Design a binder for this molecule. Structure first.
Ligand SMILES: [Mn+2]
Lengths: 338, 338
DNA sequence: GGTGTACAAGTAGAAATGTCGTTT
DNA sequence: AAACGACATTTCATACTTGTACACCTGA
DNA sequence: GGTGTACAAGTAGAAATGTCGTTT
DNA sequence: AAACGACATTTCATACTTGTACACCTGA
DNA sequence: GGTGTACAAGTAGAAATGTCGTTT
DNA sequence: AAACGACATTTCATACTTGTACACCTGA
């Protein structure tokens, strides 16, 4: 019993025995029986053998012509990056499943885009670009991160749920989780740190506020802590903090200039330029997930142990990111680079 | 110039030509040089050939043993539906990447869990069960949804941006979307409806509260418009609304009383049980995406086009889902059903 | 609810053959 | 007998169709 | 900033097949 | 020469391993 | 975040006397 | 002494009006 590939094989053999198409065909018919290609099909193959080959495959058969070739659909994404298949479909005369396939065929894949801090304003942009521009220049004259003490303030929710993902067979419930309350128990952490470590931090008790007055207390307390912790700030201290309604007030301005600290220029709506946000907290967020301290002091034991178990260089890295981190902001002409 | 399979193909041929084993090797040598398998394999082949040769394949050869039974990685999931490969791997005593593949080798895929309105108390769970049980029971006796009228308030943020997702080559960047302001401008929509459509609705001026006293005023105005829009009730309106502290006041309960409306019992923390929520706003939830509202007059404008644009089918359907919900709520024991 | 995607199955052009009369 | 030349036939990966499964969103 | 999943390339047992001396 | 039978040797789809690239979260 | 209803705990009358007149 | 009426003065007893705390909407 034979096959149309195996058949071709035999004929390669029958050929290499110096045998004619005819005396080859009648072999086949006697070995296998009457259902076996035509003499004409043997003669056919013979001609191909005298050129020489293993015709492992047929050459590609006939096929429908493409209704839209690649470079066309590619030009649609070049217009607008993120349209839906249903929707490039309409522009291409073709169905949806149709579009899915070629997208799969091309190198393409869908990814969920990034969240950006806030909708920036054409001024607000020139304003960032500049600060970045200025600070960066002033950097290269003489590095000053070595001096720089920075700080911010972030909420610590008491329970931090996040949706659980389950490995299950298609069409089954994946493990579901109950919503986090928006108006739930939460403290408020404010921490100041420098390139070496964490200098001093307060944990404002549940339902707590930071007012022009409050901040000064902290500021002065920070310095109190600073004296003994960084033994000898020869080199004047450089203070980087967000333009909160509180920090921006004239009351505090006075309390700052009297400590004589330098305030580093800062841009509105720019947490992506502020070490505490994009590096220190960013770490913490991973570390806080699925966690729930039920007591205010459990938060403190956690914070205390967290900072203590942090590496030393981890902070350095954070702070030292700043320069090229600006070089980026300016390369965007005051955009959010991501 | 053969391989080991074209080799069985020639020996299947030479077999039928009544050539002996050692006979076909002589031919095999002169056709394809001294480059082929040994006599011994021909002999071997030939015994197979004598009683159903049918080499469909090399019959499966050796392999390393498995380390964990498929069904043993399974028992891990029966414990925790939602683990990470790294984490299973560990208990399996084996590599993440290893586990990665037994997951596609078995059926399993990964899906995100539901978010669920509340961590439900042992009691609150049966508070629900009952109320469902209860309503579902009178429904069994005779449908009464024909005269059930319901409402609930819900927020309409002025800007609501969705995170945009995009088709791009691997490692290329997505599209980025500017975060929503946690607390921008928002109007607060109070709406009431029955199986025939929206009865009445008000759109509260941004930052507008709804207090025991203000609610009554609405209720009344609702009823005022009810005798007009539904003259049917001149010839018992079942009111379905949530245990809101505003809707729950001594004053309101006593106001409602002398309107002579029956208030359907409605279990606390049960928004999946109240049509307004799971059906009306849910329809809205979608058609609000990417939308912007420059002024409060647009939101009026936008509300009407929508409300009037939906056919009675849509509403009737929404209310008529109630029984199959209660049916569910009951044999879930009051747990938010899937 | 409402949407978006990708599998599942269908329904349409050259090569590889087949048929048949012609050439050696 | 052997091979060819010029038709018609049959073969099958392809480019698309519709139908629809089912992940995930949506109101809380 | 940290973590989680899949693609890539590499490294470890019985069938297929080989070598040789026996048996007809 | 043809075949076997017994003992040694080569072969390959397998089941894991390192490497990884990369989509995403993370912080406002 | 909003709000409202129950049960505080704290800051606002109607009976206790207290001090006078009296007169005999 | 001994009465007993006016009416200031000093408690005890309810009608207040903030106050704490728990409930239910909900959702960075
Ligand atoms: Mn801040």
């Amino acid at each position: 019993v034979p096959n149309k590939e195996q058949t071709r094989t035999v004929l390669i053999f029958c050929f290499h025995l110096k045998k004619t198409a005819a005396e080859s065909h009648r072999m086949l018919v006697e070995a296998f029986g009457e259902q076996v290609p035509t003499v004409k099909t043997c003669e056919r193959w013979f001609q191909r053998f005298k050129s020489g080959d293993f015709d492992v495959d047929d050459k590609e058969h006939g096929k429908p012509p493409k209704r839209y070739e690649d470079a066309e659909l590619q030009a649609l994404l070049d217009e607008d990056d993120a349209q839906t298949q249903k929707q490039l479909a309409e522009q291409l005369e073709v169905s949806q499943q149709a579009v899915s396939n070629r997208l799969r065929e091309m190198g393409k894949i869908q990814k969920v885009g990034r969240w950006v801090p806030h909708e920036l304003n054409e001024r607000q942009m020139e304003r960032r670009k500049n600060t970045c521009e200025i600070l960066l220049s002033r950097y290269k004259r003489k590095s000053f991160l070595h001096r720089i003490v920075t700080g911010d303030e972030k909420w610590i929710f008491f329970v931090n749920p996040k949706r659980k993902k389950s490995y299950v067979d298609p069409g089954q419930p994946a493990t579901s989780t109950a919503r986090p309350n928006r108006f739930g128990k939460k403290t408020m952490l404010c921490v100041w740190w420098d390139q070496s470590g964490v200098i001093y931090y307060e944990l404002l008790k549940p339902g707590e506020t930071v007012n022009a007055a409050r901040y000064q207390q902290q500021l002065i307390n920070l310095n109190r802590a600073l004296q003994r912790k960084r033994p000898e700030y020869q080199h004047r201290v450089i203070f980087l903090h967000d333009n909160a309604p509180s920090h921006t007030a004239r009351a505090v301005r006075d309390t700052l200039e009297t400590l004589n600290w330098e305030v580093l220029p800062h841009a509105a709506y720019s947490p992506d330029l502020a070490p505490s946000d994009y590096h220190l907290f960013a770490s913490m967020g991973h570390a806080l997930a699925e966690q729930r301290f039920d007591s205010y002091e459990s938060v403190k034991k956690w914070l205390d142990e967290w900072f203590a178990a942090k590496d030393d260089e981890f902070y350095w890295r954070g702070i030292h990111k700043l320069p090229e981190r600006w070089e980026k902001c300016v390369a965007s002409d005051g955009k959010y680079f991501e």
